[PDB]
Amino acid sequence: SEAQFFAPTKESPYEGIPGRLRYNVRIVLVEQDKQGNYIARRDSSTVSKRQLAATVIAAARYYAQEKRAAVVSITLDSQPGPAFGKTVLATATYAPDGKGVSGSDDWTWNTLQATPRGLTAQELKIQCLWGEMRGKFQVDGSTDERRLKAAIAKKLKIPAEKVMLNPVFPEPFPQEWTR
Numbered sequence: 001s002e003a004q005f006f007a008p009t010k011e012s013p014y015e016g017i018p019g020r021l022r023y024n025v026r027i028v029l030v031e032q033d034k035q036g037n038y039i040a041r042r043d044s045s046t047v048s049k050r051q052l053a054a055t056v057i058a059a060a061r062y063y064a065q066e067k068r069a070a071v072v073s074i075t076l077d078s079q080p081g082p083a084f085g086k087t088v089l090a091t092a093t094y095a096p097d098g099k100g101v102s103g104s105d106d107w108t109w110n111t112l113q114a115t116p117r118g119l120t121a122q123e124l125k126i127q128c129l130w131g132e133m134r135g136k137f138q139v140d141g142s143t144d145e146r147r148l149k150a151a152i153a154k155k156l157k158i159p160a161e162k163v164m165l166n167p168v169f170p171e172p173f174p175q176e177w178t179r
Contacts, residue, residue, distance in 0.1 A: 001050045003058035005030050007038065009080050013067075020103045023069035027059050027076050029089075029118065040079045044089070044118020052076060052090040052114040053173045060094035070103070071095050073111070078119050078127060084143075085131020087166045090114040092178075109178040113170040123167045126152055130165045 010026035029041035041047075056074040063072045076090040091113040095101065098108045119127070129152045137148040153160040 001048075001054060003054040004041075004047060004051055005038075006055055006059060006076070009077065011063075013069075017101070017103060020070045020101075021068070022071040022073065022101065023063050023067045024073045025059065025063055025075070027055070027074060028078075028080055029055070029076070041118070043121045043124070044078075045120040045123070047118035049114045049116050049171070049173065050177065052118065053092070053112070053177050056090045056092040056114070057094075057178055060092050064094055064096050070097060070099075071101050079124050081128060082131045084134055084165060086127055087119075087168075088113070088115075088170055089118055090170065090173075109175060112173045112175065112178070114173040115168045115170050117168060119167060122156075122158075122162075125156070126163055126167075127165055129155065130163075 006027040007030045008025050008027050012024050014022040014024060029044050029047070030038045031041045033039050056076050059074045060072045063069060072094045074092050075088060077086045078089055079086050091111050092109065093101070093111040095105070095108055099105055100107050100110065130148065133151060134143050134148060137144045149160040149163040152163045
């Protein structure tokens, strides 16, 4: 039920609401390799929903303190990559003063989401191939999923019914987990 090692991939402020700084951050799970270097976590399928939630909760609390932000949004991605080369594993928005994003809301925590588990090395590889190859499979402004699924399947020598960008959708997570 503890937070996992993470590294930010993107950080940006939003000051649209006068006197209420928002800080939006995208994070990924990391691990140490044999050489002691940090890399994108190879397999997160054994990471629980509770651990994914604890990671975004801890990151939100960290950034609120460090950037002196009134509001902090954290998105945990499956791995580094383009928009369609990764998926959301967990999310959390934190407003320490209990006034939400607007400054007149009545919440401290919102947009609490976490997938039931992380992804396997194979699921992560499929996502990476999806992101790299999809540009060659554009037909009338949309991805030809049938042909993209088949080309990944042929490359990895696996069935096409195992090929998808999002193998596991996020779920809400309880408010009591943030206490």
